[PDB]
Amino acid sequence: ASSPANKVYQDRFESMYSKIKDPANGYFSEQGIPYHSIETLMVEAPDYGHVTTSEAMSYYMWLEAMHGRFSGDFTGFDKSWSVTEQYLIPTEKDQPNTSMSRYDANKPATYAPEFQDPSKYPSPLDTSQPVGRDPINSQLTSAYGTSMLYGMHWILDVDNWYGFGARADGTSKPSYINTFQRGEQESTWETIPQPCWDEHKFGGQYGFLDLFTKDTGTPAKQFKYTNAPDADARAVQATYWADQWAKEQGKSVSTSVGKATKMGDYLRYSFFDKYFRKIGQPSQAGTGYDAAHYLLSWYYAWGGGIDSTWSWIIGSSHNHFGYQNPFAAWVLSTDANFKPKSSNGASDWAKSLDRQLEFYQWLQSAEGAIAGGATNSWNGRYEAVPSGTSTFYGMGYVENPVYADPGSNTWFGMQVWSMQRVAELYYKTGDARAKKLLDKWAKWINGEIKFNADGTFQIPSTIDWEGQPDTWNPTQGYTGNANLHVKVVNYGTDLGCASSLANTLTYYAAKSGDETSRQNAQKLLDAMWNNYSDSKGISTVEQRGDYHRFLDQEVFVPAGWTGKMPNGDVIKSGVKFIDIRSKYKQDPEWQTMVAALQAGQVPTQRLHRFWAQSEFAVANGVYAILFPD
Ligand SMILES: CO[C@@H]1O[C@H](CO)[C@@H](O[C@@H]2O[C@H](CO)[C@@H](S[C@@H]3O[C@H](CO)[C@@H](O[C@@H]4O[C@H](CO)[C@@H](O)[C@H](O)[C@H]4O)[C@H](O)[C@H]3O)[C@H](O)[C@H]2O)[C@H](O)[C@H]1O
Numbered sequence: 001a002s003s004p005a006n007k008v009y010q011d012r013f014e015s016m017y018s019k020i021k022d023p024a025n026g027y028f029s030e031q032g033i034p035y036h037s038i039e040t041l042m043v044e045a046p047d048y049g050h051v052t053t054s055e056a057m058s059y060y061m062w063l064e065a066m067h068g069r070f071s072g073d074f075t076g077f078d079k080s081w082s083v084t085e086q087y088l089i090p091t092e093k094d095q096p097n098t099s100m101s102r103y104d105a106n107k108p109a110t111y112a113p114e115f116q117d118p119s120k121y122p123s124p125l126d127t128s129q130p131v132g133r134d135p136i137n138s139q140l141t142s143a144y145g146t147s148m149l150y151g152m153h154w155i156l157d158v159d160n161w162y163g164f165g166a167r168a169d170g171t172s173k174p175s176y177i178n179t180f181q182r183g184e185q186e187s188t189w190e191t192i193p194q195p196c197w198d199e200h201k202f203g204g205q206y207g208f209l210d211l212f213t214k215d216t217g218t219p220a221k222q223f224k225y226t227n228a229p230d231a232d233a234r235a236v237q238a239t240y241w242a243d244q245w246a247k248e249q250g251k252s253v254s255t256s257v258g259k260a261t262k263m264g265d266y267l268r269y270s271f272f273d274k275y276f277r278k279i280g281q282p283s284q285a286g287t288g289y290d291a292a293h294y295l296l297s298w299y300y301a302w303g304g305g306i307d308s309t310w311s312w313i314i315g316s317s318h319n320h321f322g323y324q325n326p327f328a329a330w331v332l333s334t335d336a337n338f339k340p341k342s343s344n345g346a347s348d349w350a351k352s353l354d355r356q357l358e359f360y361q362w363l364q365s366a367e368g369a370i371a372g373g374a375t376n377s378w379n380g381r382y383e384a385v386p387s388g389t390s391t392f393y394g395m396g397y398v399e400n401p402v403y404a405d406p407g408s409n410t411w412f413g414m415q416v417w418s419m420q421r422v423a424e425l426y427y428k429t430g431d432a433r434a435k436k437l438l439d440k441w442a443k444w445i446n447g448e449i450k451f452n453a454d455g456t457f458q459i460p461s462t463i464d465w466e467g468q469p470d471t472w473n474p475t476q477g478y479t480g481n482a483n484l485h486v487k488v489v490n491y492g493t494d495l496g497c498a499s500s501l502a503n504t505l506t507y508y509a510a511k512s513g514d515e516t517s518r519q520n521a522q523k524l525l526d527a528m529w530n531n532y533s534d535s536k537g538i539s540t541v542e543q544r545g546d547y548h549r550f551l552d553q554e555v556f557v558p559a560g561w562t563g564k565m566p567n568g569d570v571i572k573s574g575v576k577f578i579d580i581r582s583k584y585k586q587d588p589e590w591q592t593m594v595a596a597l598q599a600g601q602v603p604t605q606r607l608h609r610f611w612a613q614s615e616f617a618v619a620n621g622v623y624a625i626l627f628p629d
């Protein structure tokens with residue numbers, strides 16, 4: 001039997017679970033896939049409300065696991081895994097083993113430079129630049145008996161809104177698409193949505209391929225997928241709790257545990273430099289593990305030919321603290337039920353745990369907030385690191401890893417999503433490293449939570465940075481980083497971030513006994529329940545300051561390149577964001593948004609983001625379990 005839980009907060013989880021699963025609320029598609037948000041007019045990471053992400057799927061898993069804990073029914077959790085495997089992990093038809101089996105571990109991919117401006121793309125492939133060796137492929141094919149990769153592609157056009165269909169048929173749903181392709185300055189407003197399976201049926205003469213990379217000959221028909229490591233690691237974290245909670249009740253989610261374990265094994269591809277170059281010596285090709293930074297980088301991607309057999313796989317040189325998950329690393333390296341089948345799976349994850357904790361500590365500012373990250377590829381072209389730039393294992397510090405429009409580390413959300421995992425690790429193991437990080441971080445954030453007399457509240461929203469951490473010396477450890485500072489630019493009432501914050505403070509308070517953290521977590525949960533509830537979960541009105549880009553953001557299209565989106569929209573130099581997504585004018589909220597822009601006002605929206613609703617529900621569940629009385 002599971003220990004008794006606080007009935008007040010358990011009821012709140014149950015109420016939220018009902019609203020999220022209610023068919024009338026519209027959080028899911030007819031195929032059972034959760035959308036990024038109920039509302040369709042939505043641009044922030046994905047550019048349409050009804051596309052889904054692997055992030056949403058991992059929150060769906062977490063939600064169902066918690067529901068299993070209170071209802072004793074885990075069929076919903078097993079269902080979240082079935083939907084994931086069927087729709088987000090490319091099937092045998094989506095990543096043909098005929099092509100994947102032609103992979104060459106000694107030449108994983110062909111080098112191509114990254115540019116700081118989208119106008120420099122397509123990027124030219126250069127076969128003369130060195131590429132290191134992939135040491136884990138043989139481990140995976142041997143353990144699993146296939147060359148296909150088991151990980152989630154990060155974004156999916158659920159209802160085929162863009163019209164690419166499945167494997168170029170234009171009519172099936174869901175539809176594998178990707179967006180970001182052109183570097184740090186390519187915001188969500190500057191992409192050209194493209195299909196993962198490109199047979200040249202849509203777009204230009206060669207589909208959309210030559211908008212991004214340029215080779216010596218004619219582009220081949222090909223498929224390509226991109227993983228979001230933070231989502232796959234969250235899926236493992238969620239499955240661990242589902243396993244623990246099921247066993248406390250004589251139930252089992254054994255089959256889902258096996259899927260999470262296999263996913264964690266392939267997830268190791270994010271531990272490697274993009275083109276397998278040695279960590280700390282970027283001009284040199286790696287010989288295997290010397291190319292592993294052991295952190296959960298921004299992505300690992302793979303692809304291959306559709307009508308001819310060949311394939312490639314790349315890791316990522318860019319690392320952001322917000323993607324790390326020491327808890328998932330702890331589970332995969334120590335729990336016998338989650339031991340990966342591969343020979344080095346568990347030990348690699350053990351190395352990642354130690355490295356991740358060093359990374360967090362190295363990035364901790366004077367105040368306590370965690371700074372951006374580091375890269376093994378300066379400017380995305382393995383350029384020389386400027387003199388005076390701090391390093392972590394030879395990797396140069398970057399304030400906003402991967403994206404600069406807006407900076408990937410200017411959103412407060414990265415703080416809570418990531419530190420929440422450190423709090424779970426601390427709660428379970430009492431790890432001294434996690435303790436030192438949390439004591440300082442929690443003291444910082446507790447001084448930034450503002451409660452108003454009318455029941456509303458505010459927490460940091462946009463943050464900024466000054467300075468850099470001192471160069472990491474593993475034997476010296478944390479120096480205090482006196483010259484690295486966080487600055488809060490503005491506060492807000494992001495319900496998803498506040499929920500993640502309550503979750504982090506709850507785990508931490510439960511282990512440390514810090515009363516200040518416990519009462520702030522409860523006050524946050526209470527304020528949200530009492531003042532922000534609505535018939536669909538919780539919400540508030542927020543300003544969408546970037547929406548002017550719907551109409552004024554020019555999208556770069558190379559000189560001479562012309563094509564068409566499936567609905568007929570012409571792609572050519574001079575198009576704006578809206579010109580290649582004309583179906584958006586049919587959105588119920590379109591006239592309202594345009595009217596605001598016309599009057600010189602900032603459009604506002606009342607949004608129901610799936611992850612935020614689940615975050616709130618899970619946060620109530622966690623509080624109910626850790627503070628029974
Ligand atoms: C943050 O988002 C991610 O950004 C990165 C930025 O780099 C994106 O990475 C890029 O992804 C592209 C696909 O989405 C690929 S294009 C692809 O590269 C392979 C490997 O080099 C090429 O394979 C070669 O093809 C030749 C035949 O055409 C063969 O002769 C040769 O042996 C093959 O290796 C393929 O042709 C290209 O089309 C970029 O390589 C990669 O940088 C990431 O996608 C975003 O999600």
Ligand SMILES: CO[C@@H]1O[C@H](CO)[C@@H](O[C@@H]2O[C@H](CO)[C@@H](S[C@@H]3O[C@H](CO)[C@@H](O[C@@H]4O[C@H](CO)[C@@H](O)[C@H](O)[C@H]4O)[C@H](O)[C@H]3O)[C@H](O)[C@H]2O)[C@H](O)[C@H]1O
Binds near residue numbers: 045046490491493
């Ligand atoms: C007077 O001018 C206005 O000032 C206000 C001051 O509050 C500005 O409002 C603020 O705008 C910010 C940007 O629009 C948002 S932060 C925004 O939040 C969303 C939801 O949490 C984030 O999306 C998530 O991003 C993740 C990381 O990429 C994804 O993984 C996830 O799926 C997404 O949901 C997004 O990244 C953030 O940028 C403030 O909340 C708001 O107060 C206003 O803009 C000015 O006009």
Ligand SMILES: [Ca+2]
Binds near residue numbers: 186190
């Ligand atoms: Ca830009």
